[PDB]
UniProtKB/TrEMBL annotation:
Disulfide bonds join 85-484, 117-201. This is Laccase 1. Cu(2+) 1 binds at residues 66, 109, 450. CDD domains: CuRO_3_Tv-LCC_like. It comes from Coprinopsis cinerea. InterPro entries: Cu-oxidase-like_N, Cu-oxidase_2nd, Cu-oxidase_C, Cu-oxidase_fam, Cu_oxidase_CS, Cu_oxidase_Cu_BS, Cupredoxin. Cu(2+) 3 binds at residues 393, 449, 454. GO terms for molecular function: copper ion binding; hydroquinone:oxygen oxidoreductase activity. Its EC number is 1.10.3.2.
Length: 500
């Protein structure tokens, strides 16, 4: 169950039934989404061995280590088509990188097509030896992690709405068997750093724990001042650490994660234990909770979250006064999502290899219309107005965390101490989510909607950041460029997809 910072991750197919329904899925070292853990200065060496052979799911793979900036290791970032070609079935690839002092709650997932929706994803926690919030809790370990995952009864390639919400890999579907629910154990009077992670391919969840508050202290691998709420909405790939103060009577309490969509009314109920897990106090019975949610919760508003360390947003504290000011117009036309009129389509040679081969400017890079060059060591402000169908769209920027100077639902800006994070919901029509970051990381980085079906239908762009220093900054192993030659040589039967 635990993958260490130096380890092997062997990918196989197996039949799984996390909600009591059996289907074929993907395992990592014989386990469903095992935790990867390490320390902030660790030199990670993860040999990803692709032994996938079930043709009803994608077989080639690529792993993204979500939230790690990968400075100087752009070739390990994992987005197929941008940072590497996929690792082919029967071959392996050794990713090497370091958090470089960046502690936090992260997650890993395939970044090849919609494969992570089939289960190739898991939590990744990087602990700090000098954590600023250490006095606020007693415990923080493999038992204080709470993952949320959308689970479908049909393999991703054959999707025509989630059948279940899995909490720590377990959950029920409407009309399903009374499958075992996950248990989070706590002892009255103790305080826990609970690390809540969305492994979602699509849905967002309204998360709450009956009788308890959530004291948020970390957001997407970035510390915040402690901000307490009763309920929060968490979007694809976001993470929150909240201190859970086990200050209620010894009892069982429902953990609730209500999705925005789902089959057979899953979005609107908790009946029969769907969308649920159990918080059990030591001494309480081996039984389900009979608790109810707070009927008047304080709901998280992202604009209330404030960065703790180096809080100021970069640049002149005036909207549109960054060094580089980009406004992106999302669209949906002719069956595909577009950004500034162009639907993202993966190139035949991954962006980083295009640059290592000689591309000097964005004009030389493919695909045309999807690549935006950024200069070195400048402040970039991106404005991405909501409105395009299928929202709310949670966009994620690889290579950087950003300050959200203007969140959804707010008309106000905060340049003094806005929250920093790496996935942000663009909100609804009228919202103009605005984020800032510094171009301190040479290499090509994806910027896209993390709803996997949207990314696959075109909602993405690539930033070719500091092209001139990209070759000097990054030194891929010889096996990295060899991925594309091995991949491009694959016979038709090695990549065929059996629809079911
Ligand atoms: Cu991700
Ligand atoms: Cu989207
Ligand atoms: Cu991505």
């Amino acid at each position: 169950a635990i993958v260490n910072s130096v380890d092997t991750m062997t990918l196989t197919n197996a039949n799984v039934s996390p909600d009591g329904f059996t289907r074929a899925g993907i395992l990592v070292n014989g386990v469903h989404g095992p935790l990867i853990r390490g320390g902030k200065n660790d030199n990670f060496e993860l040999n990803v061995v692709n032994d996938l052979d079930n043709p009803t799911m994608l077989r080639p793979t690529s792993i993204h280590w979500h939230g790690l900036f990968q400075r100087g290791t752009n070739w390990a970032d994992g987005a197929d088509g941008v940072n590497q070609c996929p690792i082919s079935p029967g071959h392996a690839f050794l990713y090497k990188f370091t958090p470089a002092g960046h502690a936090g709650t992260f997650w890993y997932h395939s970044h090849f097509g919609t494969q992570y929706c089939d289960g190739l994803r898991g939590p990744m926690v990087i602990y700090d030896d000098n954590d600023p919030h250490a006095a606020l809790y007693d415990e923080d370990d493999e038992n204080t992690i709470i993952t949320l995952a959308d689970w479908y009864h049909i393999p991703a390639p054959s999707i025509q709405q989630p059948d279940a919400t899995l909490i720590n890999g377990k959950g029920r579907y409407v009309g399903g068997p009374a499958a075992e629910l996950s248990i989070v154990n706590v002892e009255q009077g103790k305080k826990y750093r609970m690390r809540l992670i969305s492994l979602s391919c699509d849905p967002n969840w309204q998360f709450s724990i009956d009788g308890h508050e959530l004291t948020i202290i970390e957001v997407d691998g970035e510390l915040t001042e402690p901000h307490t709420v009763d309920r929060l909405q968490i979007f694809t790939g976001q993470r929150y650490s909240f201190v859970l103060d086990a200050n209620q009577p010894v009892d069982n309490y429902w953990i609730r994660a209500q999705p925005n969509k789902g089959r057979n009314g899953l979005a609107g109920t908790f009946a029969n234990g769907v969308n649920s897990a159990i918080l059990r106090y030591a001494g309480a019975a081996n039984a389900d909770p009979t608790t109810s949610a707070n009927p008047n919760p304080a709901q998280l508003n992202e604009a209330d979250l404030h960065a703790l360390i180096d809080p100021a947003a970069p640049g002149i504290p005036t909207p549109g006064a960054a060094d580089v000011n980009l406004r992106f117009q999302l669209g949906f036309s002719g069956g595909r999502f577009t950004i500034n009129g162009t639907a993202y389509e993966s190139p035949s040679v991954p962006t980083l290899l295009q640059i290592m081969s000689g591309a000097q400017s964005a004009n030389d890079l493919l695909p045309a219309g999807s690549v935006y060059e950024l200069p070195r060591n400048q402040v970039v402000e991106l404005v991405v107005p909501a409105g395009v169908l299928g929202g709310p769209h949670p966009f994620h920027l690889h290579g950087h965390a950003f300050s959200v100077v203007r969140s959804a639902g707010s008309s106000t800006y905060n340049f003094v101490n806005p929250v920093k994070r790496d996935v942000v919901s663009l909100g609804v029509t009228g919202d103009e989510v605005t984020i800032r970051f510094v171009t301190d990381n040479p290499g090509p980085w994806f910027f896209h909607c993390h709803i996997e079906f949207h990314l696959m239908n075109g909602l993405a762009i690539v930033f070719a950041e500091d092209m001139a220093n990209t070759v000097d900054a990054n030194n891929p192993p010889v096996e990295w460029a060899q991925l594309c030659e091995i991949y491009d040589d694959l016979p038709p039967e090695a990549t065929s997809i059996q629809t079911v």
